[PDB]
């Protein structure tokens, strides 16, 4: 009983005889990309227009269809798919006959459970399985906060949060990746949602009585002791009202911050294998297992998150559990998952909560870059950001007046510390008019002048705009009358945090007609004043902070695309797309910039960067941003950033004996050391991510507010800011590469060392472009760190010039002032003169630094940095090629030309071969000078 085959112009459609999947479509999307759609029905038309994919089936791509016996082969020059005519399972081999991806079954459809809203008759819970018993490494998937780089063998929840961004693009150690084209909440690994502690474990209290012992304290005093199965204070139901309230006795201690708690008991897993544990919390929490600490975390009360770890447990054993949670007003819940079936332990699994079909894209590629490029091809080119966006950004939550912004920008300039951009956060409008986009006349009397003064200092300014509107405002009213307001937040009477609290709602971005009004409102009221960029905050959305995720789903129902759940991950894309499109409409020659706090497949097509949101000034959090950036980049989204120093510091840092802590001078003596060391190490890390940006709540975050002029830490911070600008020719080349070469800036070691398994798992190093191996110091008071030098390359210590071999893990010198940096032998690194902002360095003189010991290649990308002319071919490359055997650097014929490009360039070349005291002394280094005119010239390396 074999399937009928229909030969389409884009591939095949198999009609399966039995099983829940009735039809299976293969679509050739490009030379290396095949779409796979398993349908429990006969009408592919029931499947929604992609929010992620803008790419249509290819017309110019040759492909063959061969059929014989029980298999049906569909192949291109680069990819072949082998489908069984028996069950419908697809098998992908490369162009040279190797199994890259095998489907197990044909999928598992089942009822939609996690949707609070009435479900479409033809919607289902999706799940596809692949490659059982694989040794594969897995990467990408987006920005996550649990330290994973290689996801193999573990779970990821691809939900949407303040701190989390799902990009369902999975990259393999092998030569392929896939795009899971579902807009709802999706899960990698375990299909299930982590249940309460008590669902797959038996609980024993303090004595051993078969739930946990929950002691309640007010300060140090013991006030109650009962036992509960599921200790749960995870969510608000309504406004500031917990879902489960605190006992009569201490209901008061919660509000005043004296309440503290302890859990005590024992857990006995009932199955043998690897268990997952998740501690969802605010305030101070420490989980202890077996008389030893496993987790120690803290977060601001209003932005909790999950903190995870995996243990190997035996079915009969009992282990001792102790927790200590000082809620300081926040939330708590412990979750857990028990080991999956035996055959599913080592396999690839993807499942969504609602959809009409299993829909994904197989993407083949000989290198990881090639695979990102297939992602870029499906979801849209990552459009050029303006050049200034890769400069330093100074933000605060918040500058309170036109005066303050201009004062802080002037301080940088006065101190000759480089800076391109300053940011105006929320609350510049009249308090009772969020959504009006007006400027409070008390603090911001002349916005055009404010922008004008910023611009006169050769800087750019960005401004916050939410999707949030008060029903009192005209702008709300306009949107509401077209039916485009998400009004359930109003019925629920949810007040925000401003003053006595205001009623408020979020618009519905899933209609282009809706986003066109949105843009026209902000165009009419903000764009006319000439702001450079849009900080599109709160685009998860976070309509009301801390409600359940079902309630969050319920709140965006109805939207243009159906239920809240059917699109839980996709809000940021249609939204940013609307702003991008209006900008193009208004100024068809300038580059827009958007920073937005959430994404999904395709976000990069809106000229948007993302950041990880409200993280906390903690070391655990700085460490975790490494994997967060890595996974985002390997997901296909490179322009990424975070808050240097974290969004919210603990209270010890904000308030002191001297009152409100603005400058570090107002800190409690004992606190200064750590605040200065945290920011020093974080600024170091920050200068080596795609966007370099200081922001957060008090204390103030300008370099001169973190420490005094002349001190070690001030000097270390100024230095890396300066380095960032010295490196701008290198960096902005990455910048151009993101678009023209479908490039990726923040690189997981697997991209550049894919044959090195040890490198796969590393979660605290990475490649910053092709040359730099970045190794942030993430431990308070550490003055060295272990650093793995990947095999197959030699490495130079960037600062000293000492040359080490790879294949080893060194103990790298990491004094406070320096983050361990190593250059890959064979790198060609261009630097420019010291500049204070990107345009100053246009057409600048170059130092070309060649790190000998291997061949090298770097093409310097240059253009005007601001315009769209690059799209009509207005840009240039200056090709650099280095042969280690001849010791010769060829600076090739200049390719291209753009408006305002200099024909002549003063370029000087030097070669590092081992230790040199001038390793970073760019201005004074011995270098051979060249007057380059676009014509190829050669520079020999010095003798012996
Ligand atoms: Cl200037
Ligand atoms: Cl200037
Ligand atoms: Cl200047
Ligand atoms: Cl200048
Ligand atoms: Ni201007
Ligand atoms: Ni200047």
Coordinates of N, CA, C and O in Angstrom, one line a residue, residues 308-457:
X308 N 18.0 26.6 36.2 CA 17.9 25.1 36.0 C 19.2 24.4 36.2 O 20.3 25.0 36.2
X309 N 19.1 23.1 36.3 CA 20.3 22.2 36.5 C 19.8 20.8 36.2 O 18.6 20.5 36.6
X310 N 20.6 19.9 35.7 CA 20.2 18.5 35.5 C 21.0 17.6 36.5 O 22.2 17.7 36.6
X311 N 20.3 16.7 37.1 CA 20.9 15.7 38.0 C 20.6 14.3 37.5 O 19.6 14.0 36.9
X312 N 21.6 13.4 37.7 CA 21.4 12.0 37.4 C 20.8 11.2 38.7 O 21.6 11.0 39.6
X313 N 19.6 10.8 38.6 CA 18.9 10.2 39.8 C 18.6 8.7 39.6 O 18.3 8.3 38.5
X314 N 18.6 8.0 40.7 CA 18.2 6.6 40.8 C 16.8 6.4 41.4 O 16.6 6.9 42.5
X315 N 16.0 5.5 40.8 CA 14.6 5.4 41.1 C 14.2 5.2 42.6 O 13.1 5.4 43.0
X316 N 15.1 4.6 43.4 CA 14.8 4.3 44.8 C 15.4 5.3 45.8 O 14.9 5.3 47.0
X317 N 16.4 6.1 45.4 CA 17.1 7.0 46.3 C 16.3 8.2 46.7 O 15.5 8.8 46.0
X318 N 16.6 8.6 48.0 CA 16.0 9.9 48.5 C 17.2 10.8 48.8 O 18.2 10.4 49.4
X319 N 17.1 12.1 48.4 CA 18.1 13.1 48.6 C 17.5 14.3 49.3 O 16.4 14.6 49.1
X320 N 18.3 14.9 50.2 CA 17.8 16.0 51.1 C 17.8 17.4 50.4 O 18.7 17.9 49.8
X321 N 16.6 18.0 50.5 CA 16.3 19.3 49.8 C 16.1 20.4 50.8 O 15.2 20.3 51.7
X322 N 16.9 21.4 50.6 CA 16.8 22.7 51.4 C 16.8 23.9 50.6 O 17.7 24.1 49.7
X323 N 15.8 24.8 50.7 CA 15.7 26.0 50.0 C 15.6 27.2 50.9 O 15.1 27.0 52.0
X324 N 16.1 28.3 50.5 CA 16.0 29.5 51.3 C 15.5 30.7 50.4 O 16.4 31.3 49.8
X325 N 14.3 31.1 50.5 CA 13.7 32.1 49.6 C 13.3 33.4 50.4 O 12.2 33.4 51.0
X326 N 14.0 34.5 50.3 CA 13.7 35.8 50.8 C 13.0 36.7 49.8 O 13.6 37.6 49.3
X327 N 11.7 36.5 49.5 CA 10.9 36.9 48.4 C 11.0 38.4 48.1 O 10.8 38.8 47.0
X328 N 11.3 39.2 49.2 CA 11.4 40.7 49.0 C 10.3 41.2 48.0 O 10.6 42.1 47.2
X329 N 9.1 40.5 48.0 CA 8.0 41.0 47.2 C 7.7 40.3 45.9 O 6.8 40.6 45.2
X330 N 8.5 39.3 45.6 CA 8.5 38.6 44.3 C 7.8 37.2 44.3 O 6.9 37.0 45.0
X331 N 8.3 36.4 43.4 CA 7.6 35.1 43.2 C 8.5 33.9 43.3 O 9.7 34.0 43.4
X332 N 7.8 32.7 43.4 CA 8.5 31.4 43.5 C 7.7 30.2 43.1 O 6.5 30.2 43.3
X333 N 8.4 29.3 42.4 CA 7.8 28.0 42.1 C 8.9 27.0 41.7 O 9.8 27.4 40.9
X334 N 8.9 25.8 42.2 CA 9.8 24.8 41.7 C 9.1 23.9 40.7 O 8.0 23.4 40.9
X335 N 9.8 23.7 39.5 CA 9.3 22.8 38.5 C 10.3 21.6 38.4 O 11.4 21.6 39.0
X336 N 10.0 20.7 37.5 CA 10.7 19.5 37.4 C 10.2 18.7 36.2 O 9.0 18.7 35.9
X337 N 11.1 17.9 35.6 CA 10.8 16.9 34.6 C 11.6 15.7 34.9 O 12.8 15.7 35.2
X338 N 10.9 14.5 34.8 CA 11.6 13.2 35.0 C 12.1 12.7 33.6 O 11.7 13.2 32.6
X339 N 13.1 11.8 33.6 CA 13.7 11.3 32.4 C 12.7 10.8 31.4 O 11.7 10.2 31.8
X340 N 12.8 11.1 30.1 CA 12.0 10.6 29.1 C 12.2 9.1 28.8 O 13.2 8.5 29.4
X341 N 11.3 8.5 28.1 CA 11.5 7.1 27.7 C 13.0 6.8 27.2 O 13.7 7.8 26.9
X342 N 13.4 5.6 27.2 CA 14.8 5.3 27.0 C 15.3 5.6 25.6 O 16.4 6.2 25.4
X343 N 14.5 5.4 24.6 CA 14.8 5.6 23.2 C 14.8 7.1 22.8 O 15.4 7.5 21.9
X344 N 14.1 7.9 23.6 CA 14.0 9.3 23.4 C 15.1 10.1 24.1 O 15.3 11.3 23.8
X345 N 15.8 9.5 25.0 CA 16.9 10.1 25.8 C 17.9 10.8 24.9 O 18.1 12.0 25.1
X346 N 18.4 10.2 23.9 CA 19.4 10.8 23.0 C 18.8 11.0 21.6 O 19.2 10.3 20.7
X347 N 17.8 11.9 21.5 CA 17.2 12.2 20.1 C 16.8 13.6 20.0 O 16.8 14.4 21.0
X348 N 16.5 14.0 18.8 CA 16.1 15.4 18.5 C 14.6 15.5 18.5 O 13.9 14.9 17.7
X349 N 14.0 16.4 19.4 CA 12.6 16.6 19.4 C 12.1 18.0 19.4 O 12.5 18.8 20.2
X350 N 11.1 18.3 18.5 CA 10.5 19.6 18.4 C 9.0 19.5 18.5 O 8.4 18.8 17.7
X351 N 8.4 20.3 19.4 CA 6.9 20.3 19.5 C 6.3 21.7 19.8 O 6.9 22.4 20.6
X352 N 5.3 22.0 19.1 CA 4.6 23.3 19.3 C 3.2 23.1 20.0 O 2.7 21.9 20.0
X353 N 2.6 24.1 20.6 CA 1.4 24.0 21.4 C 0.2 24.0 20.5 O -0.8 23.3 20.8
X354 N 0.2 24.8 19.4 CA -0.9 24.8 18.5 C -0.4 25.1 17.0 O 0.6 25.9 16.8
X355 N -1.0 24.5 16.1 CA -0.7 24.6 14.7 C -1.6 23.8 13.9 O -2.3 23.0 14.4
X356 N -1.5 23.9 12.5 CA -2.4 23.1 11.7 C -1.6 22.0 11.0 O -2.2 21.1 10.4
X357 N -0.3 22.0 11.1 CA 0.6 21.1 10.4 C 2.0 21.2 10.9 O 2.4 22.1 11.6
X358 N 2.8 20.1 10.7 CA 4.2 20.1 10.9 C 4.9 20.7 9.7 O 4.9 20.1 8.6
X359 N 5.5 21.9 9.9 CA 6.0 22.7 8.9 C 7.4 23.1 9.3 O 7.6 23.8 10.3
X360 N 8.4 22.7 8.5 CA 9.8 23.2 8.7 C 10.6 23.2 7.4 O 10.2 22.7 6.4
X361 N 11.8 23.8 7.5 CA 12.7 23.9 6.4 C 14.0 23.2 6.7 O 14.7 23.6 7.7
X362 N 14.4 22.3 5.9 CA 15.8 21.7 6.0 C 16.7 22.7 5.3 O 16.5 23.0 4.1
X363 N 17.8 23.0 6.0 CA 18.8 23.9 5.4 C 20.2 23.2 5.5 O 20.8 23.0 6.5
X364 N 20.8 22.9 4.3 CA 22.1 22.3 4.2 C 23.2 23.3 4.0 O 23.1 24.3 3.4
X365 N 24.4 23.0 4.6 CA 25.5 23.9 4.5 C 26.9 23.4 5.0 O 27.0 22.9 6.1
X366 N 27.9 23.6 4.2 CA 29.2 23.0 4.5 C 29.9 23.7 5.7 O 30.7 23.1 6.4
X367 N 29.5 24.9 5.9 CA 29.9 25.6 7.1 C 28.7 26.1 7.9 O 27.6 26.2 7.3
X368 N 28.9 26.4 9.1 CA 27.8 27.0 9.9 C 27.3 28.3 9.2 O 26.1 28.6 9.1
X369 N 28.3 29.2 8.7 CA 27.9 30.4 8.0 C 27.0 30.1 6.8 O 26.1 31.0 6.6
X370 N 27.2 29.0 6.2 CA 26.4 28.7 5.0 C 25.0 28.4 5.5 O 24.0 28.5 4.7
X371 N 24.9 27.9 6.7 CA 23.6 27.5 7.2 C 22.8 28.7 7.7 O 21.6 28.9 7.4
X372 N 23.5 29.7 8.4 CA 22.9 30.9 8.7 C 22.3 31.6 7.4 O 21.2 32.1 7.4
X373 N 23.1 31.5 6.4 CA 22.7 32.1 5.1 C 21.4 31.5 4.5 O 20.7 32.2 3.8
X374 N 21.2 30.3 4.8 CA 19.9 29.7 4.4 C 18.8 30.2 5.2 O 17.7 30.4 4.7
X375 N 19.1 30.4 6.5 CA 18.1 31.1 7.4 C 17.8 32.5 6.9 O 16.7 32.9 6.8
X376 N 18.9 33.2 6.5 CA 18.7 34.6 6.1 C 17.9 34.6 4.8 O 17.2 35.5 4.6
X377 N 18.0 33.5 4.1 CA 17.4 33.4 2.8 C 15.9 33.2 2.9 O 15.1 33.8 2.1
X378 N 15.5 32.5 3.9 CA 14.1 32.2 4.2 C 13.4 33.3 4.9 O 12.2 33.6 4.6
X379 N 14.1 34.0 5.8 CA 13.4 35.0 6.7 C 13.9 36.4 6.4 O 13.4 37.4 7.0
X380 N 14.8 36.6 5.5 CA 15.1 37.9 5.0 C 16.5 38.4 5.4 O 17.0 38.1 6.5
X381 N 17.1 39.1 4.5 CA 18.5 39.6 4.7 C 18.5 40.5 6.0 O 17.6 41.2 6.2
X382 N 19.6 40.3 6.8 CA 19.8 41.2 7.9 C 20.3 42.6 7.3 O 21.5 42.7 7.0
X383 N 19.4 43.5 7.2 CA 19.7 44.8 6.6 C 20.7 45.6 7.4 O 20.8 45.5 8.6
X384 N 21.5 46.4 6.7 CA 22.5 47.2 7.3 C 21.9 48.1 8.4 O 20.9 48.8 8.2
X385 N 22.5 48.1 9.6 CA 22.3 49.1 10.6 C 23.2 50.3 10.2 O 24.1 50.1 9.5
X386 N 22.8 51.4 10.7 CA 23.7 52.5 10.4 C 25.1 52.2 11.1 O 25.1 51.6 12.1
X387 N 26.2 52.8 10.6 CA 27.5 52.6 11.2 C 27.6 53.0 12.6 O 28.2 52.3 13.4
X388 N 27.0 54.1 13.0 CA 27.0 54.5 14.4 C 26.4 53.5 15.4 O 26.7 53.6 16.6
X389 N 25.7 52.6 14.9 CA 25.1 51.6 15.8 C 26.1 50.7 16.5 O 25.8 50.0 17.5
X390 N 27.2 50.5 15.8 CA 28.3 49.6 16.3 C 29.2 50.4 17.2 O 30.2 49.9 17.7
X391 N 29.0 51.7 17.3 CA 29.7 52.6 18.2 C 29.2 52.3 19.6 O 28.3 51.5 19.8
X392 N 29.7 53.0 20.6 CA 29.3 53.0 22.0 C 27.9 53.7 22.2 O 27.7 54.8 21.7
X393 N 27.0 53.0 22.9 CA 25.7 53.6 23.3 C 25.6 53.9 24.8 O 25.9 52.9 25.6
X394 N 25.3 55.1 25.2 CA 25.0 55.4 26.6 C 23.5 55.6 26.9 O 22.9 56.5 26.3
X395 N 23.0 54.7 27.7 CA 21.6 54.9 28.1 C 21.4 55.0 29.6 O 22.3 54.7 30.3
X396 N 20.2 55.4 30.1 CA 19.8 55.3 31.5 C 18.3 55.1 31.6 O 17.6 55.5 30.8
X397 N 18.0 54.4 32.6 CA 16.6 54.4 33.1 C 16.5 55.2 34.4 O 16.7 54.6 35.5
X398 N 16.3 56.5 34.3 CA 16.1 57.2 33.0 C 16.6 58.6 33.1 O 16.7 59.2 34.2
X399 N 17.0 59.2 32.0 CA 17.2 60.6 31.9 C 15.9 61.4 32.0 O 15.0 61.0 31.4
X400 N 15.9 62.4 32.9 CA 14.6 63.0 33.3 C 14.3 64.3 32.5 O 13.2 64.8 32.6
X401 N 15.3 64.8 31.8 CA 15.1 66.1 31.1 C 16.0 66.3 29.9 O 17.1 65.7 29.8
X402 N 15.6 67.2 29.0 CA 16.4 67.5 27.9 C 17.8 67.9 28.4 O 18.8 67.3 27.9
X403 N 17.8 68.7 29.4 CA 19.1 69.2 30.1 C 20.0 68.0 30.5 O 21.2 68.0 30.2
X404 N 19.5 67.0 31.2 CA 20.3 65.9 31.7 C 21.0 65.1 30.5 O 22.2 64.9 30.6
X405 N 20.2 64.7 29.5 CA 20.8 64.1 28.4 C 21.9 64.9 27.8 O 23.1 64.4 27.8
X406 N 21.7 66.1 27.4 CA 22.8 66.9 26.9 C 23.9 67.1 27.9 O 25.1 67.1 27.5
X407 N 23.6 67.1 29.2 CA 24.7 67.2 30.1 C 25.6 66.0 30.2 O 26.9 66.1 30.2
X408 N 25.0 64.8 30.1 CA 25.8 63.6 30.2 C 26.6 63.3 28.9 O 27.7 62.9 28.9
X409 N 26.0 63.7 27.7 CA 26.7 63.5 26.5 C 27.9 64.5 26.4 O 28.9 64.1 26.0
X410 N 27.7 65.7 27.0 CA 28.7 66.7 27.0 C 29.9 66.2 27.9 O 31.1 66.5 27.6
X411 N 29.6 65.5 29.0 CA 30.6 65.0 29.9 C 31.5 64.0 29.1 O 32.7 64.0 29.2
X412 N 30.9 63.0 28.4 CA 31.8 62.2 27.5 C 32.7 63.0 26.6 O 33.9 62.9 26.8
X413 N 32.2 63.8 25.8 CA 32.9 64.7 24.9 C 34.0 65.5 25.7 O 35.2 65.5 25.3
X414 N 33.6 66.0 26.9 CA 34.6 66.8 27.6 C 35.8 66.0 28.0 O 36.9 66.4 28.1
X415 N 35.5 64.7 28.4 CA 36.4 63.8 28.9 C 37.1 63.0 27.8 O 37.8 62.0 28.0
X416 N 36.9 63.4 26.5 CA 37.4 62.7 25.4 C 37.2 61.2 25.4 O 38.0 60.5 24.8
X417 N 36.2 60.7 26.0 CA 35.8 59.3 26.0 C 34.8 59.1 24.8 O 33.8 59.7 24.8
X418 N 35.2 58.3 23.8 CA 34.4 58.1 22.6 C 32.9 57.6 22.9 O 32.7 56.9 23.9
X419 N 32.0 58.1 22.1 CA 30.6 57.8 22.2 C 29.8 58.3 21.0 O 30.0 59.4 20.5
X420 N 28.9 57.4 20.4 CA 28.1 57.8 19.3 C 26.6 58.2 19.6 O 26.0 59.0 18.9
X421 N 26.0 57.5 20.6 CA 24.6 57.4 20.8 C 24.2 57.6 22.3 O 24.9 57.0 23.1
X422 N 23.2 58.3 22.5 CA 22.6 58.4 23.9 C 21.2 58.0 23.7 O 20.6 58.2 22.7
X423 N 20.6 57.5 24.8 CA 19.2 57.1 24.7 C 18.2 57.7 25.7 O 18.6 58.0 26.8
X424 N 17.0 58.1 25.2 CA 16.0 58.6 26.1 C 15.0 57.5 26.3 O 14.3 57.0 25.4
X425 N 14.9 57.0 27.6 CA 14.0 56.0 28.0 C 12.6 56.5 28.1 O 12.3 57.7 27.8
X426 N 11.7 55.7 28.7 CA 10.3 56.0 28.9 C 10.0 57.3 29.8 O 10.9 57.8 30.4
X427 N 8.8 57.7 29.7 CA 8.2 58.7 30.6 C 8.6 60.2 30.4 O 8.6 61.0 31.3
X428 N 8.8 60.5 29.1 CA 9.0 61.9 28.6 C 7.7 62.6 28.3 O 7.6 63.7 27.9
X429 N 6.6 61.8 28.4 CA 5.3 62.4 28.0 C 4.6 62.8 29.3 O 5.2 62.6 30.4
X430 N 3.5 63.5 29.2 CA 2.7 63.8 30.4 C 2.3 62.5 31.1 O 1.9 61.6 30.4
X431 N 2.4 62.5 32.4 CA 2.2 61.2 33.1 C 0.9 60.5 32.7 O 0.9 59.3 32.5
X432 N -0.2 61.3 32.4 CA -1.5 60.7 32.1 C -1.8 60.6 30.6 O -3.0 60.6 30.2
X433 N -0.8 60.4 29.8 CA -0.9 60.3 28.4 C 0.1 59.3 27.7 O 0.5 59.6 26.6
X434 N 0.4 58.2 28.4 CA 1.2 57.2 27.7 C 0.5 56.8 26.4 O -0.7 56.5 26.4
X435 N 1.2 56.8 25.3 CA 0.6 56.5 24.0 C 0.3 57.8 23.2 O 0.0 57.7 22.0
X436 N 0.3 58.9 23.9 CA 0.0 60.2 23.1 C 1.3 60.6 22.4 O 1.2 61.3 21.4
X437 N 2.4 60.1 22.8 CA 3.7 60.4 22.2 C 4.1 61.9 22.3 O 4.9 62.4 21.6
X438 N 3.4 62.7 23.2 CA 3.7 64.1 23.5 C 4.9 64.2 24.4 O 5.3 63.3 25.2
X439 N 5.5 65.4 24.5 CA 6.6 65.6 25.4 C 6.2 66.6 26.5 O 5.9 67.7 26.2
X440 N 6.1 66.1 27.7 CA 6.0 66.9 28.9 C 6.7 68.2 28.7 O 7.9 68.2 28.4
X441 N 6.1 69.3 28.9 CA 6.7 70.6 28.6 C 7.6 71.1 29.8 O 8.4 72.0 29.6
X442 N 7.4 70.4 31.0 CA 8.2 70.8 32.1 C 9.7 70.4 31.9 O 10.6 71.1 32.3
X443 N 9.9 69.2 31.3 CA 11.2 68.6 31.2 C 11.7 68.5 29.8 O 13.0 68.5 29.6
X444 N 10.8 68.6 28.8 CA 11.2 68.4 27.4 C 10.5 69.4 26.5 O 9.8 69.0 25.6
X445 N 10.8 70.7 26.8 CA 10.0 71.7 26.2 C 10.1 71.8 24.7 O 9.2 72.2 24.0
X446 N 11.3 71.5 24.1 CA 11.6 71.5 22.7 C 12.3 70.3 22.3 O 13.6 70.2 22.4
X447 N 11.6 69.3 21.8 CA 12.3 68.0 21.4 C 13.2 68.2 20.2 O 14.3 67.7 20.1
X448 N 12.7 69.0 19.2 CA 13.5 69.3 18.0 C 14.9 69.9 18.4 O 15.9 69.5 17.8
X449 N 14.9 70.8 19.4 CA 16.1 71.4 19.8 C 17.0 70.4 20.6 O 18.2 70.4 20.4
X450 N 16.4 69.6 21.4 CA 17.1 68.5 22.0 C 17.9 67.6 21.0 O 19.1 67.4 21.2
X451 N 17.1 67.1 20.0 CA 17.8 66.4 19.0 C 18.8 67.3 18.3 O 19.9 66.8 18.0
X452 N 18.5 68.5 18.0 CA 19.4 69.4 17.4 C 20.8 69.6 18.1 O 21.8 69.5 17.5
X453 N 20.7 69.7 19.5 CA 21.9 69.8 20.3 C 22.6 68.5 20.4 O 23.9 68.5 20.4
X454 N 21.9 67.4 20.4 CA 22.6 66.1 20.3 C 23.4 66.0 19.0 O 24.6 65.6 18.9
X455 N 22.7 66.3 17.9 CA 23.3 66.2 16.6 C 24.5 67.1 16.4 O 25.5 66.7 15.8
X456 N 24.4 68.3 17.0 CA 25.5 69.2 16.9 C 26.8 68.7 17.6 O 27.9 69.2 17.3
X457 N 26.6 67.8 18.5 CA 27.7 67.1 19.2 C 28.0 65.8 18.5 O 28.6 64.9 19.0

